[PDB]
Design a protein around this ligand. Structure first.
Ligand SMILES: Cc1cccc(C(=O)NCC(=O)O)c1
Length: 150
């Protein structure tokens, strides 16, 4: 009973979370997951400010109201070579990664590791936060409040 959460640097408090190495998060699960990091789904304005501080990924993830990819450098295989906050328009499917916003994070680029899941609740799952540098933090608990996500 294990969940891996790969996380990035934070940029103006915004970061990306990929669950179990695949697109696997629903919109309801994403809100609950960010809540476990004392965070919320970013607004489009919060995401645009994060982009301006250096944030880019090559993965679709939820923000409030849309599914996006923040892009700085044009790359043919990331958001069809677009720059800026690329908004997904047409898709058949509902599962993606998520972005989260922590208002207590530093204002600009914070590439230190994440070493806690401060607001997870009691539960049976071994949840492991995996940083890009490989460092890991694990705790037994749960964050999903909707039975359909479990
Ligand atoms: C768990 C998490 C995710 C992203 C960012 C942070 C963070 O810098 N918090 C500072 C604080 O709580 O005072 C924590």
């Amino acid at each position: 009973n294990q969940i891996d959460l790969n996380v990035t640097c934070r940029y103006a408090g915004v970061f990306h979370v990929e669950k179990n190495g695949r697109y696997s998060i629903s919109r309801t699960e994403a809100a609950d997951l960010c809540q476990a990091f004392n965070s919320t789904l970013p607004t489009m304005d919060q995401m645009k400010l994060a982009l301006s501080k250096g944030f880019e990924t090559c993965r679709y993830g939820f923000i409030e109201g849309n599914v996006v990819i923040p892009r700085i450098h044009p790359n043919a295989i990331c958001a069809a070579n677009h720059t800026g906050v690329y908004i997904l328009v047409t898709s058949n499917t509902s599962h993606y990664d998520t972005y989260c916003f922590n208002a207590s994070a530093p204002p600009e680029e914070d590439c230190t590791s994440v070493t806690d899941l401060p607001n997870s609740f009691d539960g049976p799952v071994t949840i492991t936060i995996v940083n890009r540098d490989g460092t890991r933090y694990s705790k037994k608990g749960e964050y999903r409040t909707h039975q359909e996500d479990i």
